[PDB]
Amino acid sequence: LRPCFVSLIDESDKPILIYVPNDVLKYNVLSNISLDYFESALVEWHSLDSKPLLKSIFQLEGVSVFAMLIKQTGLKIVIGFEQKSLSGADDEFEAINQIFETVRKIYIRVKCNPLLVSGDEKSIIKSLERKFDELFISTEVELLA
Ligand SMILES: [Cl-]
User: Fold this and answer.
1) CB 3.0 to 4.6 Å from 7: which of 42, 58, 62, 78, for a disulfide?
2) Which GO terms describe its cellular component?
């Protein structure tokens, strides 16, 4: 379940980052399409209960795109996966949900990092990218296989 891309967008609809682990045009387009779902009058972003809801919003060019809105903060998370690799099993949706939770925690830990909290946006973005690399980047060994 290696993501194709991870996008974070803030409560005012300004992108925080579009991360691609390792085209940049493709995922910018997919991210923009996703923002249209967040703005739609016909999308329900929440469950009956308070647990944040994972949504499968669309699939395009072999990328299955999932998204979530954090009700209380307005944070928007968008993650794409390789569609042909997906089983659709319950355990896989639970794994995808875990990835959303982990991405959110990482974000909160970076933006409220004891040093970065008082620093510029560029430094937060750089830190987010390295934290996401530790999770998502394919190793030399994985690439050769
Ligand atoms: Cl949040």
Assistant:
1) 78
2) cytoplasm; cytosol; Golgi apparatus; nucleus; TRAPP complex; TRAPPII protein complex
